[PDB]
Enzyme design. Structure first.
Site, mmCIF file in Angstrom:
data_model
loop_
_atom_site.group_PDB
_atom_site.id
_atom_site.type_symbol
_atom_site.label_atom_id
_atom_site.label_comp_id
_atom_site.label_asym_id
_atom_site.label_seq_id
_atom_site.Cartn_x
_atom_site.Cartn_y
_atom_site.Cartn_z
ATOM 1 N N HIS A 252 32.776 27.161 45.549
ATOM 2 C CA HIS A 252 32.193 28.444 45.180
ATOM 3 C C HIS A 252 33.212 29.574 45.292
ATOM 4 O O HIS A 252 33.064 30.476 46.118
ATOM 5 C CB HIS A 252 30.985 28.743 46.072
ATOM 6 N N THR B 256 38.358 40.575 46.816
ATOM 7 C CA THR B 256 39.295 39.545 47.223
ATOM 8 C C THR B 256 38.618 38.182 47.281
ATOM 9 O O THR B 256 37.691 37.961 48.056
ATOM 10 C CB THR B 256 39.931 39.878 48.581
ATOM 11 N N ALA C 188 32.368 40.075 44.626
ATOM 12 C CA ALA C 188 32.942 40.377 43.331
ATOM 13 C C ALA C 188 31.888 40.274 42.233
ATOM 14 O O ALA C 188 31.877 41.071 41.304
ATOM 15 C CB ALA C 188 34.093 39.417 43.053
ATOM 16 N N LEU C 189 30.984 39.308 42.352
ATOM 17 C CA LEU C 189 29.954 39.129 41.344
ATOM 18 C C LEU C 189 28.973 40.291 41.204
ATOM 19 O O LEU C 189 28.312 40.410 40.174
ATOM 20 C CB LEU C 189 29.184 37.828 41.591
ATOM 21 N N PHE D 16 34.386 41.467 52.009
ATOM 22 C CA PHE D 16 33.991 40.401 52.894
ATOM 23 C C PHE D 16 34.992 40.516 54.026
ATOM 24 O O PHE D 16 34.626 40.531 55.196
ATOM 25 C CB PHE D 16 34.129 39.039 52.224
#
Ligand SMILES: [Ca+2]
Ligand SMILES: [Ca+2]
Ligand SMILES: [Ca+2]
Ligand SMILES: [Ca+2]
Ligand SMILES: [Ca+2]
Lengths: 147, 146, 147, 147, 146
Positions: free
Chosen positions: C80, C72, C43-44, C12
């Site tokens: 969230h 990160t 990351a998900l 990101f």
């Protein structure tokens, strides 16, 4: 033809459970869907119960179209409550994905005894009602995708 | 062209549109096709995808990816936090388990205000990002030959 | 012959990601290992990405000896973030167990931009490098047991 | 004929880890069991390591009768301690059920260095010894049920 | 008649005795038999049941249900909420995953006093309730013909 649901209720508060059961039965009847009802010691046993029904149906038993989970968890003074609420919601959700089944989640997580009824009765919140509709809604999609 | 399945949970019709609008836009702009179904809550999105996956195993629509959309604001009741964690959890697991491309567009804000600051494709466009995530994953999924 | 791993980075923040990647790459090069790099939005999506690679390898695709997950997560103003931190970790952990694979977990979970750099940079805490080294240690164990 | 376990130690604090490992090894020695020792950098890497060992056994590799997981998490500054604690415990437990194996859980989660020693040292709480014994206990129950 | 496996995690011999007592009483009262095995902590209970199930497959004792007993008293540290959380989580999953009847008698109290209030059969009889819970689940398991 009309979906036959399996209502799995966890009851510790006969009065409260009756509200949810009624709430769920209400929406189900208005939708015109048949249904059975089994009772379990607690919310945590709901998933396994559904699992029992699925196994039975695989042995020629009743082949349910959907399931409605009813139960009430109030955060009292003991720690044996926050765990129940989380894990039950978790198990039900996983079961729904794992077994690709329609499951209406009516496991209410209330703070005090008051909100239990606010959410219980079908006149007020009618959380047991939404659970059934959710179930039917899910049954609808399950059918739609021909899963 | 990738045919995605958009599964949305809606309680606040309004907020849900900003998200579906964002998701649909992103998919349109990329030239991706898609179908849209609705569920009562974020928690049902995982199971819905599951149906679609089973349905495709029986001559059903053969989706290339999925887009999950919903909004979960932390109010006062506790039936919010749990919905947020599990939905995310179940979606993540589902993606690993079935090795599928899932765009996670389930918003978890603190208030109604922050909801639109993420929903509207004019703002953070969370729905659009979710759709793009899906496309990204679909592309990765193909690149690897999964 | 030398270890070949798949670096899966969620980016990101382009700069922070380059720092982690530099860390991961430096550690891998130092050991003589090779690697491919793929990017995902968050990351998900790292667990699934790895899942894709494993599947693709079962289809004549690239056969990786281990994976390095870089990401990160900055605890911003929105809620969230704690979710992404927990699930990504849990998802990666399960995947490594479930699939018996070497995974260096380099998904940072920091309070702010400042700590992000403190952790992402090879010159400082080098989490990218440690994640790569962890992946290498795991590959070693994996080969040792003949899994 | 005596149980042969695999001790998987997450090693960061060398001295603490030595105390822990000393506790485990002593417990295994006193019971006449043998063991191999492997090192991973974090507790999150223990479950997978155990996973490798199991995979290796199926591949003609060393067959272990149980596993001892050693580690020490001290709540410090980073938020990467609460996650490691919960997820490692979750991963190991899950692994023990899923694979039906004997695992002694000696991953310590303490508030600080002082408590880490109190727990890690054989001369004190001897958590390493408890985990090694917990492992032998599970191996005993495993053989009992003829599993 | 039903034959159950009672898996008790015991640290506080006194509390464990209470729960066990309560469980056995509830099972004898229903005419169900049982074997008792002991583990060090609540977290080893899921795996123990797993061993039983496994052993049955090799001509070992076939249990119709299981009763898990243990007491996790939240002290001054947070390493009690972990054990409490993951043990309840693991049992629920095992019951679903293996479709077995499991009575959850793992107590999670704030202090010792409460443990006794939950442990003693004269009181909240949690041990008896777990045993009863297991019987109910066995009945249901039979009803659906699981
Ligand atoms: Ca500063
Ligand atoms: Ca002191
Ligand atoms: Ca076996
Ligand atoms: Ca009676
Ligand atoms: Ca048998």
């Amino acid at each position: 033809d009309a979906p036959h649901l399996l209502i799995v209720e966890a009851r510790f508060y006969d009065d409260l459970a009756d509200a949810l059961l009624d709430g769920a039965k209400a929406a189900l009847d208005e939708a015109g869907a048949t249904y059975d009802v089994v009772t379990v010691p607690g919310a945590l046993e709901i998933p396994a119960t559904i699992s029992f029904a699925l196994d039975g149906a695989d042995n020629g038993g009743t082949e349910y179209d959907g399931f409605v989970a009813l139960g009430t968890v109030i955060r009292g003074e003991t720690y044996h409550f926050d765990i129940v609420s989380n894990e039950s919601c978790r198990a039900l959700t996983d079961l729904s994905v794992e077994e690709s089944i329609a499951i209406g989640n009516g496991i209410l997580t209330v703070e005090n005894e008051e909100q239990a009824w606010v959410h219980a009765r079908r006149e007020d919140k009618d959380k047991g009602g939404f659970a059934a509709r959710a179930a039917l809604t899910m049954i609808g999609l399950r059918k739609k995708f021909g899963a």
